[PDB]
Design a protein around this ligand. Sequence first.
Ligand SMILES: Nc1ncnc2c1ncn2[C@@H]1O[C@@H]2COP(=O)(O)O[C@H]2[C@H]1O
Ligand SMILES: Nc1ncnc2c1ncn2[C@@H]1O[C@@H]2COP(=O)(O)O[C@H]2[C@H]1O
Lengths: 200, 200
Amino acid sequence: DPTLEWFLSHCHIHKYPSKSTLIHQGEKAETLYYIVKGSVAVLIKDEEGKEMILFYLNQGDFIGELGLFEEGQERSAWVRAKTACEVAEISYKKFRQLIQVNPDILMRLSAQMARRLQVTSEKVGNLAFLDVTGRIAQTLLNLAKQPDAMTHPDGMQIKITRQEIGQIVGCSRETVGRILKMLEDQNLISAHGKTIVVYG
Amino acid sequence: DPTLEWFLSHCHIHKYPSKSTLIHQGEKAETLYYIVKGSVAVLIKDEEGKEMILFYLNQGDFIGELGLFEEGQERSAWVRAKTACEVAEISYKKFRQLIQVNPDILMRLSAQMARRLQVTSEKVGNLAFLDVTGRIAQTLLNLAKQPDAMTHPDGMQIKITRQEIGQIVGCSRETVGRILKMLEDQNLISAHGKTIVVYG
Ligand SMILES: Nc1ncnc2c1ncn2[C@@H]1O[C@@H]2COP(=O)(O)O[C@H]2[C@H]1O
Ligand SMILES: Nc1ncnc2c1ncn2[C@@H]1O[C@@H]2COP(=O)(O)O[C@H]2[C@H]1O
Protein backbone atom coordinates (compact mmCIF):
# COMPACT_ATOMS: atom_id res chain seq x y z
CA ASP A 1 0.00 0.00 0.00
CA PRO A 2 1.36 3.51 -0.97
CA THR A 3 -0.53 5.10 1.97
CA LEU A 4 1.12 2.73 4.49
CA GLU A 5 4.52 3.53 3.06
CA TRP A 6 3.70 7.17 3.67
CA PHE A 7 2.93 6.28 7.29
CA LEU A 8 5.92 3.97 7.71
CA SER A 9 8.57 6.44 6.49
CA HIS A 10 7.72 8.53 9.59
CA CYS A 11 8.36 5.47 11.82
CA HIS A 12 11.46 3.92 13.39
CA ILE A 13 11.59 0.17 12.77
CA HIS A 14 12.72 -2.33 15.44
CA LYS A 15 13.03 -6.09 15.37
CA TYR A 16 11.83 -8.16 18.33
CA PRO A 17 12.85 -11.78 18.92
CA SER A 18 10.06 -14.30 19.27
CA LYS A 19 8.85 -14.21 22.93
CA SER A 20 10.02 -10.67 23.78
CA THR A 21 7.53 -8.15 25.19
CA LEU A 22 6.73 -5.04 23.05
CA ILE A 23 4.23 -3.48 25.42
CA HIS A 24 3.97 -3.88 29.18
CA GLN A 25 0.57 -3.28 30.65
CA GLY A 26 0.49 -0.19 32.87
CA GLU A 27 3.27 1.65 30.99
CA LYS A 28 2.35 5.14 29.77
CA ALA A 29 0.95 5.01 26.27
CA GLU A 30 2.68 7.58 24.13
CA THR A 31 3.49 5.63 20.99
CA LEU A 32 1.68 3.80 18.19
CA TYR A 33 3.04 0.54 16.70
CA TYR A 34 2.66 -1.26 13.39
CA ILE A 35 3.53 -4.89 12.69
CA VAL A 36 5.61 -4.88 9.48
CA LYS A 37 6.34 -8.62 9.86
CA GLY A 38 5.50 -11.37 12.35
CA SER A 39 2.71 -11.92 14.89
CA VAL A 40 2.09 -11.13 18.55
CA ALA A 41 -0.22 -12.08 21.36
CA VAL A 42 -2.24 -9.63 23.37
CA LEU A 43 -2.50 -10.83 26.97
CA ILE A 44 -3.98 -9.82 30.26
CA LYS A 45 -3.26 -11.47 33.63
CA ASP A 46 -5.11 -12.07 36.88
CA GLU A 47 -4.29 -11.71 40.56
CA GLU A 48 -1.85 -14.66 40.58
CA GLY A 49 -0.28 -13.65 37.27
CA LYS A 50 -2.39 -16.10 35.26
CA GLU A 51 -2.47 -15.30 31.52
CA MET A 52 -5.32 -14.93 29.09
CA ILE A 53 -4.69 -14.46 25.37
CA LEU A 54 -7.00 -11.74 24.25
CA PHE A 55 -6.11 -11.57 20.56
CA TYR A 56 -3.39 -12.46 18.04
CA LEU A 57 -2.23 -9.61 15.90
CA ASN A 58 -0.23 -9.96 12.75
CA GLN A 59 1.57 -8.15 9.99
CA GLY A 60 -0.41 -5.06 9.03
CA ASP A 61 -2.07 -4.68 12.43
CA PHE A 62 -1.48 -1.52 14.50
CA ILE A 63 -0.77 -1.99 18.21
CA GLY A 64 -0.74 0.48 21.08
CA GLU A 65 -3.56 2.55 19.57
CA LEU A 66 -5.86 2.61 22.59
CA GLY A 67 -4.14 5.45 24.43
CA LEU A 68 -4.01 7.64 21.30
CA PHE A 69 -7.21 9.58 21.76
CA GLU A 70 -6.61 10.91 25.22
CA GLU A 71 -3.39 12.05 26.81
CA GLY A 72 -2.09 10.27 29.91
CA GLN A 73 -3.23 6.65 29.72
CA GLU A 74 -1.76 3.26 30.35
CA ARG A 75 -1.11 0.27 28.16
CA SER A 76 -4.27 -1.88 28.56
CA ALA A 77 -2.53 -5.22 28.02
CA TRP A 78 0.86 -6.88 27.41
CA VAL A 79 1.76 -7.55 23.85
CA ARG A 80 4.31 -10.30 23.27
CA ALA A 81 6.07 -11.41 20.08
CA LYS A 82 4.51 -14.76 19.10
CA THR A 83 7.21 -15.22 16.48
CA ALA A 84 10.14 -12.94 15.66
CA CYS A 85 8.77 -9.52 14.64
CA GLU A 86 9.55 -6.28 12.89
CA VAL A 87 7.45 -3.47 14.34
CA ALA A 88 7.37 0.19 13.17
CA GLU A 89 6.87 2.74 15.93
CA ILE A 90 5.85 6.39 16.15
CA SER A 91 4.92 8.90 18.85
CA TYR A 92 1.23 9.75 19.17
CA LYS A 93 2.21 13.43 18.65
CA LYS A 94 3.72 12.67 15.22
CA PHE A 95 0.84 10.32 14.38
CA ARG A 96 -1.88 12.86 15.24
CA GLN A 97 -0.26 15.16 12.67
CA LEU A 98 -0.27 12.52 9.92
CA ILE A 99 -4.03 12.25 10.55
CA GLN A 100 -4.19 16.00 9.81
CA VAL A 101 -2.49 15.59 6.49
CA ASN A 102 -4.23 12.35 5.60
CA PRO A 103 -7.29 11.24 7.67
CA ASP A 104 -7.33 8.01 5.68
CA ILE A 105 -4.66 6.69 8.06
CA LEU A 106 -7.00 7.25 11.09
CA MET A 107 -9.63 5.57 9.00
CA ARG A 108 -7.48 2.42 8.66
CA LEU A 109 -6.89 2.35 12.37
CA SER A 110 -10.53 2.83 13.27
CA ALA A 111 -11.41 -0.10 11.08
CA GLN A 112 -9.15 -2.52 12.97
CA MET A 113 -10.59 -1.05 16.18
CA ALA A 114 -14.14 -1.59 15.09
CA ARG A 115 -13.19 -5.18 14.25
CA ARG A 116 -11.44 -5.86 17.57
CA LEU A 117 -14.54 -4.60 19.31
CA GLN A 118 -16.82 -7.01 17.40
CA VAL A 119 -14.48 -9.92 18.04
CA THR A 120 -13.89 -9.10 21.70
CA SER A 121 -17.66 -8.68 22.22
CA GLU A 122 -18.14 -12.13 20.64
CA LYS A 123 -15.45 -13.41 22.99
CA VAL A 124 -17.40 -11.88 25.90
CA GLY A 125 -20.53 -13.63 24.62
CA ASN A 126 -18.57 -16.89 24.40
CA LEU A 127 -17.53 -16.88 28.01
CA ALA A 128 -20.96 -15.96 29.23
CA PHE A 129 -22.89 -18.49 27.15
CA LEU A 130 -20.71 -21.60 26.56
CA ASP A 131 -19.54 -24.50 28.64
CA VAL A 132 -15.77 -24.88 28.83
CA THR A 133 -16.17 -27.67 26.31
CA GLY A 134 -18.03 -25.29 24.02
CA ARG A 135 -15.41 -22.56 24.28
CA ILE A 136 -12.58 -25.03 23.62
CA ALA A 137 -14.47 -26.15 20.52
CA GLN A 138 -15.01 -22.55 19.39
CA THR A 139 -11.35 -21.73 20.07
CA LEU A 140 -10.22 -24.47 17.69
CA LEU A 141 -12.38 -23.15 14.82
CA ASN A 142 -11.13 -19.60 15.29
CA LEU A 143 -7.55 -20.91 15.38
CA ALA A 144 -7.98 -22.85 12.14
CA LYS A 145 -9.29 -19.60 10.64
CA GLN A 146 -6.15 -17.69 11.60
CA PRO A 147 -4.32 -16.28 8.61
CA ASP A 148 -1.52 -18.69 9.56
CA ALA A 149 -3.86 -21.68 9.89
CA MET A 150 -2.24 -24.41 7.81
CA THR A 151 -4.06 -26.89 5.62
CA HIS A 152 -4.66 -30.61 6.05
CA PRO A 153 -6.55 -33.08 3.81
CA ASP A 154 -9.39 -33.53 6.34
CA GLY A 155 -9.79 -29.87 7.27
CA MET A 156 -7.56 -27.16 8.68
CA GLN A 157 -4.50 -27.88 10.81
CA ILE A 158 -3.12 -25.91 13.75
CA LYS A 159 -0.32 -25.96 16.29
CA ILE A 160 -0.83 -24.77 19.87
CA THR A 161 0.06 -26.07 23.33
CA ARG A 162 -2.70 -27.18 25.71
CA GLN A 163 -1.68 -24.30 27.96
CA GLU A 164 -2.14 -21.66 25.25
CA ILE A 165 -5.70 -22.95 24.73
CA GLY A 166 -6.04 -23.01 28.48
CA GLN A 167 -5.17 -19.32 28.50
CA ILE A 168 -7.47 -18.53 25.60
CA VAL A 169 -10.45 -20.22 27.37
CA GLY A 170 -9.53 -19.55 31.01
CA CYS A 171 -9.19 -23.23 31.93
CA SER A 172 -6.21 -25.35 33.07
CA ARG A 173 -4.01 -27.45 30.78
CA GLU A 174 -5.39 -30.44 32.67
CA THR A 175 -9.01 -29.59 31.81
CA VAL A 176 -7.89 -28.77 28.26
CA GLY A 177 -6.41 -32.26 28.17
CA ARG A 178 -9.67 -34.05 29.07
CA ILE A 179 -11.74 -31.99 26.66
CA LEU A 180 -9.35 -32.45 23.75
CA LYS A 181 -9.44 -36.22 24.23
CA MET A 182 -13.23 -36.11 24.55
CA LEU A 183 -13.60 -34.06 21.32
CA GLU A 184 -11.30 -36.58 19.67
CA ASP A 185 -13.55 -39.46 20.77
CA GLN A 186 -16.35 -37.49 19.15
CA ASN A 187 -13.99 -37.57 16.18
CA LEU A 188 -14.27 -33.78 15.96
CA ILE A 189 -10.50 -33.27 16.11
CA SER A 190 -7.28 -35.27 16.07
CA ALA A 191 -4.36 -34.61 18.42
CA HIS A 192 -0.95 -36.09 17.70
CA GLY A 193 1.17 -34.05 20.07
CA LYS A 194 0.97 -30.27 19.76
CA THR A 195 -0.75 -30.47 16.38
CA ILE A 196 -4.52 -30.53 16.23
CA VAL A 197 -6.66 -31.21 13.20
CA VAL A 198 -9.89 -29.24 13.09
CA TYR A 199 -12.58 -30.09 10.51
CA GLY A 200 -14.76 -27.58 8.64
CA ASP B 1 -19.91 22.08 20.58
CA PRO B 2 -19.19 23.53 17.08
CA THR B 3 -18.21 20.25 15.27
CA LEU B 4 -21.06 18.25 16.84
CA GLU B 5 -23.91 20.53 15.91
CA TRP B 6 -22.42 20.36 12.44
CA PHE B 7 -22.56 16.59 12.59
CA LEU B 8 -26.12 16.64 13.92
CA SER B 9 -27.54 19.04 11.32
CA HIS B 10 -26.84 16.30 8.75
CA CYS B 11 -28.87 13.80 10.84
CA HIS B 12 -32.55 12.95 11.14
CA ILE B 13 -33.67 12.84 14.78
CA HIS B 14 -36.08 10.21 16.13
CA LYS B 15 -37.48 9.62 19.60
CA TYR B 16 -37.67 6.09 21.00
CA PRO B 17 -39.82 5.14 23.98
CA SER B 18 -38.08 3.49 26.89
CA LYS B 19 -37.79 -0.28 26.11
CA SER B 20 -37.99 -0.04 22.30
CA THR B 21 -35.26 -1.60 20.16
CA LEU B 22 -33.10 0.77 18.01
CA ILE B 23 -30.84 -1.88 16.51
CA HIS B 24 -31.61 -5.54 15.93
CA GLN B 25 -28.60 -7.81 15.76
CA GLY B 26 -28.13 -9.32 12.31
CA GLU B 27 -29.72 -6.37 10.43
CA LYS B 28 -27.54 -4.82 7.73
CA ALA B 29 -25.48 -1.98 9.11
CA GLU B 30 -25.81 1.03 6.89
CA THR B 31 -26.43 3.82 9.38
CA LEU B 32 -24.65 5.54 12.26
CA TYR B 33 -26.54 6.70 15.38
CA TYR B 34 -25.96 9.34 18.04
CA ILE B 35 -27.70 9.55 21.41
CA VAL B 36 -28.89 13.16 21.79
CA LYS B 37 -30.77 12.29 25.00
CA GLY B 38 -31.39 9.17 27.09
CA SER B 39 -29.56 5.88 27.59
CA VAL B 40 -29.59 2.42 26.01
CA ALA B 41 -28.39 -1.08 26.69
CA VAL B 42 -26.24 -3.07 24.32
CA LEU B 43 -27.20 -6.75 24.54
CA ILE B 44 -26.27 -10.06 23.06
CA LYS B 45 -28.23 -13.33 23.52
CA ASP B 46 -27.45 -17.03 23.62
CA GLU B 47 -28.93 -20.15 22.10
CA GLU B 48 -32.09 -20.04 24.29
CA GLY B 49 -32.46 -16.27 23.88
CA LYS B 50 -30.79 -15.50 27.20
CA GLU B 51 -29.62 -11.87 27.48
CA MET B 52 -26.29 -10.36 28.47
CA ILE B 53 -25.88 -6.61 28.87
CA LEU B 54 -22.67 -5.72 27.17
CA PHE B 55 -22.59 -1.96 27.79
CA TYR B 56 -24.79 1.01 28.68
CA LEU B 57 -24.53 3.92 26.31
CA ASN B 58 -25.75 7.38 27.02
CA GLN B 59 -26.25 10.85 25.65
CA GLY B 60 -23.27 11.76 23.49
CA ASP B 61 -22.38 8.17 22.61
CA PHE B 62 -22.47 7.03 18.96
CA ILE B 63 -24.13 3.68 18.24
CA GLY B 64 -24.07 1.47 15.15
CA GLU B 65 -20.50 2.47 14.28
CA LEU B 66 -19.05 -1.03 13.95
CA GLY B 67 -20.22 -1.68 10.39
CA LEU B 68 -18.96 1.71 9.16
CA PHE B 69 -15.51 0.72 7.99
CA GLU B 70 -16.47 -2.09 5.67
CA GLU B 71 -19.46 -2.40 3.42
CA GLY B 72 -21.92 -5.27 3.94
CA GLN B 73 -21.90 -6.12 7.64
CA GLU B 74 -24.44 -6.94 10.29
CA ARG B 75 -25.42 -5.29 13.52
CA SER B 76 -23.24 -7.02 16.16
CA ALA B 77 -25.73 -6.64 19.02
CA TRP B 78 -29.21 -5.41 19.94
CA VAL B 79 -29.43 -1.93 21.32
CA ARG B 80 -32.48 -1.18 23.44
CA ALA B 81 -33.72 2.12 24.91
CA LYS B 82 -33.05 1.91 28.67
CA THR B 83 -35.08 5.08 29.18
CA ALA B 84 -36.92 7.15 26.57
CA CYS B 85 -34.39 8.38 23.99
CA GLU B 86 -33.75 10.87 21.25
CA VAL B 87 -31.29 9.44 18.71
CA ALA B 88 -29.84 11.23 15.65
CA GLU B 89 -29.27 8.99 12.63
CA ILE B 90 -27.27 9.21 9.41
CA SER B 91 -26.28 6.89 6.55
CA TYR B 92 -22.69 5.67 6.54
CA LYS B 93 -22.37 7.16 3.01
CA LYS B 94 -23.20 10.67 4.30
CA PHE B 95 -21.04 10.15 7.39
CA ARG B 96 -17.96 9.03 5.44
CA GLN B 97 -18.18 12.36 3.60
CA LEU B 98 -18.33 14.41 6.80
CA ILE B 99 -15.09 12.66 7.77
CA GLN B 100 -13.64 14.03 4.50
CA VAL B 101 -14.57 17.57 5.38
CA ASN B 102 -13.72 17.25 9.05
CA PRO B 103 -11.69 14.19 10.25
CA ASP B 104 -12.17 15.41 13.81
CA ILE B 105 -15.58 13.71 13.78
CA LEU B 106 -13.95 10.29 12.99
CA MET B 107 -11.53 11.16 15.73
CA ARG B 108 -14.39 11.49 18.28
CA LEU B 109 -15.81 8.17 17.20
CA SER B 110 -12.51 6.35 17.36
CA ALA B 111 -12.07 7.57 20.90
CA GLN B 112 -15.32 5.98 22.09
CA MET B 113 -14.28 2.85 20.21
CA ALA B 114 -10.91 2.72 21.85
CA ARG B 115 -12.67 3.07 25.20
CA ARG B 116 -15.27 0.36 24.55
CA LEU B 117 -12.40 -1.93 23.62
CA GLN B 118 -10.59 -1.30 26.92
CA VAL B 119 -13.77 -1.78 28.91
CA THR B 120 -14.91 -4.86 27.02
CA SER B 121 -11.43 -6.40 27.36
CA GLU B 122 -11.68 -5.75 31.12
CA LYS B 123 -15.06 -7.49 31.20
CA VAL B 124 -13.47 -10.48 29.39
CA GLY B 125 -11.08 -10.75 32.31
CA ASN B 126 -13.87 -11.27 34.86
CA LEU B 127 -15.78 -13.72 32.72
CA ALA B 128 -12.73 -15.89 32.29
CA PHE B 129 -11.62 -15.80 35.95
CA LEU B 130 -14.99 -15.79 37.79
CA ASP B 131 -17.72 -18.40 37.92
CA VAL B 132 -21.41 -17.52 38.08
CA THR B 133 -21.19 -17.11 41.83
CA GLY B 134 -17.94 -15.15 41.62
CA ARG B 135 -19.25 -12.74 39.01
CA ILE B 136 -22.47 -12.14 40.95
CA ALA B 137 -20.31 -11.34 43.99
CA GLN B 138 -18.10 -8.99 41.93
CA THR B 139 -21.18 -7.35 40.41
CA LEU B 140 -22.50 -6.44 43.86
CA LEU B 141 -19.23 -4.72 44.88
CA ASN B 142 -19.09 -2.71 41.67
CA LEU B 143 -22.73 -1.73 42.15
CA ALA B 144 -22.12 -0.53 45.71
CA LYS B 145 -19.26 1.55 44.28
CA GLN B 146 -21.54 3.28 41.80
CA PRO B 147 -21.67 7.02 42.30
CA ASP B 148 -25.34 6.47 43.22
CA ALA B 149 -24.55 3.64 45.64
CA MET B 150 -26.39 4.58 48.84
CA THR B 151 -25.10 4.08 52.35
CA HIS B 152 -26.14 1.65 55.06
CA PRO B 153 -24.78 1.16 58.60
CA ASP B 154 -23.25 -2.26 57.77
CA GLY B 155 -21.78 -1.32 54.40
CA MET B 156 -23.09 0.06 51.14
CA GLN B 157 -26.69 -0.39 49.99
CA ILE B 158 -28.02 -0.90 46.47
CA LYS B 159 -31.25 -1.43 44.58
CA ILE B 160 -31.44 -3.71 41.53
CA THR B 161 -33.78 -6.44 40.30
CA ARG B 162 -32.51 -9.99 40.04
CA GLN B 163 -32.99 -9.76 36.30
CA GLU B 164 -30.74 -6.70 35.98
CA ILE B 165 -27.99 -8.65 37.77
CA GLY B 166 -28.87 -11.58 35.55
CA GLN B 167 -28.20 -9.36 32.54
CA ILE B 168 -25.01 -7.95 34.02
CA VAL B 169 -23.61 -11.49 34.63
CA GLY B 170 -25.27 -13.36 31.76
CA CYS B 171 -27.27 -15.69 34.02
CA SER B 172 -31.01 -16.15 34.58
CA ARG B 173 -33.06 -14.48 37.34
CA GLU B 174 -33.59 -17.99 38.68
CA THR B 175 -29.84 -18.66 39.02
CA VAL B 176 -29.41 -15.13 40.41
CA GLY B 177 -32.02 -16.09 42.99
CA ARG B 178 -30.17 -19.18 44.26
CA ILE B 179 -26.83 -17.40 44.40
CA LEU B 180 -28.19 -14.37 46.24
CA LYS B 181 -29.72 -16.63 48.89
CA MET B 182 -26.48 -18.60 49.10
CA LEU B 183 -24.38 -15.42 49.53
CA GLU B 184 -26.85 -14.38 52.21
CA ASP B 185 -26.34 -17.67 54.08
CA GLN B 186 -22.65 -16.85 53.90
CA ASN B 187 -23.83 -13.60 55.48
CA LEU B 188 -22.03 -11.70 52.71
CA ILE B 189 -25.17 -9.77 51.71
CA SER B 190 -28.74 -9.20 52.88
CA ALA B 191 -31.74 -9.19 50.54
CA HIS B 192 -35.06 -7.78 51.69
CA GLY B 193 -36.84 -7.49 48.37
CA LYS B 194 -35.11 -5.48 45.64
CA THR B 195 -32.65 -3.94 48.10
CA ILE B 196 -29.35 -5.65 48.73
CA VAL B 197 -26.82 -4.80 51.40
CA VAL B 198 -23.19 -5.47 50.60
CA TYR B 199 -21.05 -5.50 53.79
CA GLY B 200 -17.95 -3.38 54.48
N1 LIG C 1 -9.53 -6.68 22.97
C1 LIG C 1 -8.41 -6.40 22.28
N2 LIG C 1 -8.28 -6.85 20.99
C2 LIG C 1 -7.17 -6.56 20.31
N3 LIG C 1 -6.12 -5.87 20.69
C3 LIG C 1 -6.26 -5.43 21.99
C4 LIG C 1 -7.35 -5.64 22.83
N4 LIG C 1 -7.16 -5.05 24.09
C5 LIG C 1 -5.98 -4.50 23.96
N5 LIG C 1 -5.36 -4.68 22.70
C6 LIG C 1 -4.02 -4.15 22.23
O1 LIG C 1 -3.18 -4.15 23.39
C7 LIG C 1 -2.37 -3.04 23.27
C8 LIG C 1 -1.63 -2.68 24.57
O2 LIG C 1 -1.79 -1.32 25.08
P1 LIG C 1 -2.72 -0.15 24.38
O3 LIG C 1 -3.97 -0.16 25.21
O4 LIG C 1 -1.87 1.05 24.34
O5 LIG C 1 -2.94 -0.72 22.89
C9 LIG C 1 -3.40 -2.05 22.94
C10 LIG C 1 -4.09 -2.67 21.83
O6 LIG C 1 -3.36 -2.54 20.65
N1 LIG D 1 -18.42 -4.38 23.12
C1 LIG D 1 -19.21 -3.34 22.86
N2 LIG D 1 -19.10 -2.19 23.61
C2 LIG D 1 -19.91 -1.16 23.33
N3 LIG D 1 -20.86 -1.07 22.38
C3 LIG D 1 -20.95 -2.22 21.64
C4 LIG D 1 -20.18 -3.38 21.81
N4 LIG D 1 -20.53 -4.37 20.88
C5 LIG D 1 -21.47 -3.79 20.18
N5 LIG D 1 -21.79 -2.46 20.56
C6 LIG D 1 -22.83 -1.53 19.91
O1 LIG D 1 -23.84 -2.40 19.35
C7 LIG D 1 -24.19 -1.81 18.15
C8 LIG D 1 -25.03 -2.70 17.18
O2 LIG D 1 -24.55 -2.85 15.80
P1 LIG D 1 -23.19 -2.17 15.21
O3 LIG D 1 -22.23 -3.29 15.18
O4 LIG D 1 -23.54 -1.54 13.96
O5 LIG D 1 -22.86 -1.05 16.29
C9 LIG D 1 -22.85 -1.54 17.61
C10 LIG D 1 -22.21 -0.82 18.68
O6 LIG D 1 -22.62 0.53 18.71
